[PDB]
Amino acid sequence: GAMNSSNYAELFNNDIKLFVDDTNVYRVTVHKTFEGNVATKAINGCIFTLNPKTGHLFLKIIHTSVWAGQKRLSQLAKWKTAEEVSALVRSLPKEEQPKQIIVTRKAMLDPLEVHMLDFPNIAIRPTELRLPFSAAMSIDKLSDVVMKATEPQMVLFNIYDDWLDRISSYTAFSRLTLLLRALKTNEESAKMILLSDPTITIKSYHLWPSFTDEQWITIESQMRDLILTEYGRKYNV
Amino acid sequence: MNTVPFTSAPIEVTIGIDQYSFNVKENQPFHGIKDIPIGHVHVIHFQHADNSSMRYGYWFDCRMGNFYIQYDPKDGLYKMMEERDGAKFENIVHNFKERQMMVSYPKIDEDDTWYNLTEFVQMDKIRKIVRKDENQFSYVDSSMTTVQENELSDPAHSLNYTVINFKSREAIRPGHEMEDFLDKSYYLNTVMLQGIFKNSSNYFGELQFAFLNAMFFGNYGSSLQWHAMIELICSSATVPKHMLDKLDEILYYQIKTLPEQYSDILLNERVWNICLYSSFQKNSLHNTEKIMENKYPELL
Ligand SMILES: O=C1NCCN1C1CC1
């Protein structure tokens, strides 16, 4: 059934599973027209498809040309997401195909179920977790890969860098969701935390900085403070 | 005008004949139902006084044979049987009529209700949904499950309605996922009407039979089938104009005949609100929308 705090360790067992987040697929800027009406302009988007055990992130970039001449784009966006996830699964060797796909928004359930009818043994699940994957476009290198695209494209990234050499996939996921939650609540401060110290760099083949174990504990603490800080600034506490 | 005699009435029972019903007391001198209109299927149904559990009954067409009812004290129910000896049967009926031991099918001359509820229902199609080929009549009761219910357990006692499933490869053309899921016209017109039912009359017949089993027996799987067949039409953008107009008439008479006190269990809020207010056909069911809004405005 639905994925929640009670069955949270299931994410890190040995059954292949993917999270699918569609919140960055259809992105627009809203603006005024010369006549003073309002119009939207689409910008490039992306499907965020993540194996939480391995960190492998199948980022399917959605180029604005896919919307051309189409109506009801927010509805289309869900079906386009389901089409691309289904195509991804079909492209994988059988032993790499997931046994479950967890969608972060319940509105993806029917589009994905219909696109995956050919795969009756792959469970399509919702989740009660409020996961911060919309903030994926606050990861500089990821945002850059999406905005520069001139055509559809999907790139395989590892969202954990080399962390699994030193920590478990439970801890890596926890660190990821904390970083993304922070970037979602206050992107400027979060990014200030992550880069403030010019001696810690991001490798050319890495997304996040090369923190020692001790520095990650400092960083992680500073993100919790930020999230708590903002929760106060927000609610006045 | 045809007759279904009863050997006797040894247990107290409420007897239904189509949309009519009457109470018979234990060992009361009741010997059947006369003046049954020829030209329609009919259903004769039963609810025992001591155990309202299991409504049960028999679909039949008096043009297909001479049928009577006889209580079986071993299986504990009123059973329909065919009498092959035509002269024995005529003589039984004439005797019971002379002794005035029969109730008269109580049809008001003005009243087209039963026709309107069974317009497309044929006995031959009933017998394919309810498989028991040695009898000309068909038994249905409250508990019988449908083929589709059994997929999700005794196959010989099942209602073999046409399986409809909106999230199924049958309903969804590869590469037309979104189109076919949001507009079911392909599934209605190509898969179901052209492919399986052959014409809209057979589709309506199954829809009407499904409603009548839901109403008369409280058969839950029949109610599921009735609503699915409605939803498939309402969720299609492209439906022949004559089908929509006929559907509006069919549903009107069904909603009109429904017991007011059973509306809570016989009508699916989601399907009806979707069909009348959100679907492609939200503006095509004028008679049905008007009676629903005046009779069951709570559901909506
Ligand atoms: O890990 C990173 N950072 C962004 C580029 N690179 C992947 C594409 C090879």
Side-chain angles (χ1 to χ4, degrees), chain A, chain B residues 1-151 154-300:
Chain A
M3 206 277 290
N4 56 29
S5 303
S6 301
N7 55 29
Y8 185 74
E10 184 178 17
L11 295 179
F12 314 109
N13 77 15
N14 287 78
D15 292 353
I16 303 175
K17 45 181 71 64
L18 298 169
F19 277 118
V20 170
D21 181 89
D22 71 314
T23 66
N24 282 309
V25 165
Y26 174 49
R27 299 203 287 166
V28 304
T29 54
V30 179
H31 61 83
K32 281 287 193 56
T33 72
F34 182 84
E35 294 78 27
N37 306 121
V38 174
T40 60
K41 187 192 152 303
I43 59 158
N44 287 347
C46 60
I47 307 163
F48 180 99
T49 297
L50 172 67
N51 188 326
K53 178 102 174 155
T54 62
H56 289 207
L57 168 65
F58 311 82
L59 186 70
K60 162 63 182 205
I61 316 186
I62 303 299
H63 190 260
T64 58
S65 64
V66 308
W67 311 127
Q70 307 293 327
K71 277 114 178 64
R72 294 190 50 87
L73 297 185
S74 68
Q75 179 179 72
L76 183 61
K78 298 173 200 318
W79 292 87
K80 176 59 172 190
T81 296
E83 187 181 15
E84 290 297 338
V85 169
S86 168
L88 169 61
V89 169
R90 294 167 210 277
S91 79
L92 289 166
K94 188 183 189 220
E95 76 282 350
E96 298 183 34
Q97 295 173 338
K99 297 118 197 177
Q100 303 172 16
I101 300 169
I102 306 161
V103 299
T104 61
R105 307 201 289 177
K106 303 189 209 68
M108 282 304 304
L109 285 172
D110 276 356
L112 190 59
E113 163 165 11
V114 168
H115 268 280
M116 301 287 290
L117 291 171
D118 291 332
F119 292 93
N121 299 342
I122 301 181
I124 307 298
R125 302 179 56 200
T127 181
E128 298 298 348
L129 306 182
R130 44 273 186 180
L131 293 159
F133 296 146
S134 66
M137 289 298 93
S138 291
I139 299 169
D140 309 290
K141 297 198 167 186
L142 291 205
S143 182
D144 285 349
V145 97
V146 169
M147 290 314 290
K148 292 186 212 297
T150 61
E151 40 186 326
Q153 175 178 347
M154 101 95 71
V155 168
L156 216 215
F157 297 97
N158 189 329
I159 204 166
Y160 297 153
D161 295 341
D162 60 352
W163 302 343
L164 293 182
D165 296 350
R166 304 196 62 84
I167 67 187
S168 65
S169 67
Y170 179 108
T171 299
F173 191 73
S174 293
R175 177 183 291 165
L176 173 66
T177 56
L178 172 67
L179 292 170
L180 287 178
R181 181 58 69 198
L183 288 160
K184 187 167 174 176
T185 320
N186 192 318
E187 183 176 19
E188 184 211 307
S189 314
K191 294 192 180 200
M192 285 177 61
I193 297 176
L194 288 162
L195 325 167
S196 57
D197 181 349
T199 71
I200 319 175
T201 64
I202 301 171
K203 304 277 136 304
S204 47
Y205 53 90
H206 280 157
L207 307 163
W208 306 100
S210 297
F211 292 124
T212 61
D213 291 12
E214 297 310 297
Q215 289 174 339
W216 269 121
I217 300 287
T218 305
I219 294 295
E220 291 171 340
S221 322
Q222 290 174 11
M223 295 295 191
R224 291 187 290 265
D225 289 341
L226 175 164
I227 291 167
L228 182 61
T229 290
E230 278 313 316
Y231 181 103
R233 286 173 86 253
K234 193 211 240 200
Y235 293 103
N236 296 313
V237 166
Chain B
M1 300 311 247
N2 276 130
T3 303
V4 170
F6 276 51
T7 295
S8 66
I11 70 169
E12 197 154 292
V13 62
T14 305
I15 302 175
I17 176 71
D18 299 348
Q19 77 271 30
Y20 309 111
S21 79
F22 52 94
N23 300 307
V24 177
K25 296 297 175 298
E26 181 192 312
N27 288 321
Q28 172 189 324
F30 172 82
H31 291 290
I33 307 170
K34 58 176 192 165
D35 302 330
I36 302 168
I38 307 169
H40 308 117
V41 307
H42 295 289
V43 59
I44 182 177
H45 44 111
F46 301 92
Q47 192 148 223
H48 298 183
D50 66 14
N51 168 61
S52 62
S53 304
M54 187 189 48
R55 280 181 261 167
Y56 61 96
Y58 304 88
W59 291 94
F60 64 96
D61 182 332
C62 277
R63 297 170 287 191
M64 297 173 59
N66 300 315
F67 306 113
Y68 65 102
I69 300 290
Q70 181 158 308
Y71 183 74
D72 176 13
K74 175 163 167 77
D75 293 343
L77 81 182
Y78 288 98
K79 291 193 174 166
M80 182 165 281
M81 300 195 277
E82 184 170 356
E83 177 55 72
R84 75 162 290 117
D85 184 353
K88 180 178 191 182
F89 186 86
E90 287 176 13
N91 176 244
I92 285 303
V93 171
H94 173 274
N95 174 84
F96 288 157
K97 280 196 186 180
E98 272 295 273
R99 304 228 291 152
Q100 299 200 32
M101 299 268 87
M102 300 189 167
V103 289
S104 172
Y105 186 95
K107 190 182 163 304
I108 301 322
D109 311 294
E110 164 199 45
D111 184 17
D112 270 354
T113 293
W114 189 244
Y115 173 74
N116 291 336
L117 289 167
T118 63
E119 175 171 5
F120 302 96
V121 182
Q122 320 174 269
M123 201 62 224
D124 67 86
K125 294 313 199 310
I126 287 177
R127 297 184 68 234
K128 299 173 187 310
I129 298 167
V130 189
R131 314 192 156 286
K132 192 169 202 277
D133 292 319
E134 64 274 17
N135 299 325
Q136 290 286 285
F137 48 81
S138 299
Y139 170 93
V140 182
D141 71 29
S142 298
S143 73
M144 283 169 50
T145 55
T146 70
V147 161
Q148 173 172 67
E149 281 179 306
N150 296 328
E151 298 168 0
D154 184 23
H157 209 50
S158 285
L159 293 164
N160 297 273
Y161 295 118
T162 295
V163 175
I164 300 173
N165 175 1
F166 296 139
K167 297 195 277 185
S168 71
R169 176 50 68 217
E170 295 67 38
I172 304 287
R173 287 177 294 178
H176 295 264
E177 286 82 6
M178 181 184 196
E179 170 182 22
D180 282 353
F181 185 72
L182 292 178
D183 173 5
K184 318 212 177 270
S185 299
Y186 152 74
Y187 190 31
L188 172 67
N189 294 308
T190 301
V191 177
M192 288 279 166
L193 284 175
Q194 176 180 294
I196 298 187
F197 287 96
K198 307 307 184 177
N199 53 60
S200 57
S201 295
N202 291 332
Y203 186 97
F204 288 146
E206 186 168 327
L207 185 157
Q208 290 181 313
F209 182 58
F211 171 79
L212 291 164
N213 288 325
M215 185 172 59
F216 287 129
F217 306 111
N219 185 271
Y220 179 82
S222 298
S223 181
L224 290 180
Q225 184 69 14
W226 178 51
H227 284 92
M229 295 188 77
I230 295 168
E231 191 172 351
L232 176 57
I233 291 173
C234 292
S235 297
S236 290
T238 303
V239 183
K241 313 85 170 54
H242 72 280
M243 262 193 90
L244 296 171
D245 288 336
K246 186 63 67 163
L247 180 64
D248 191 31
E249 293 303 312
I250 284 165
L251 298 179
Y252 174 81
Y253 283 105
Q254 287 170 342
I255 299 305
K256 178 175 171 59
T257 303
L258 272 184
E260 302 67 23
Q261 297 293 312
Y262 292 20
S263 52
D264 49 325
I265 55 189
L266 284 170
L267 298 173
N268 187 275
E269 178 181 72
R270 177 190 70 84
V271 167
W272 283 100
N273 268 279
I274 275 57
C275 289
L276 296 179
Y277 301 124
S278 331
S279 75
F280 288 106
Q281 307 303 339
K282 61 192 183 306
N283 292 316
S284 312
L285 302 177
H286 304 111
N287 295 352
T288 289
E289 181 167 296
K290 187 170 297 312
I291 193 178
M292 282 289 289
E293 294 184 350
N294 280 281
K295 194 184 175 196
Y296 300 118
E298 327 88 50
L299 201 80
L300 329 163

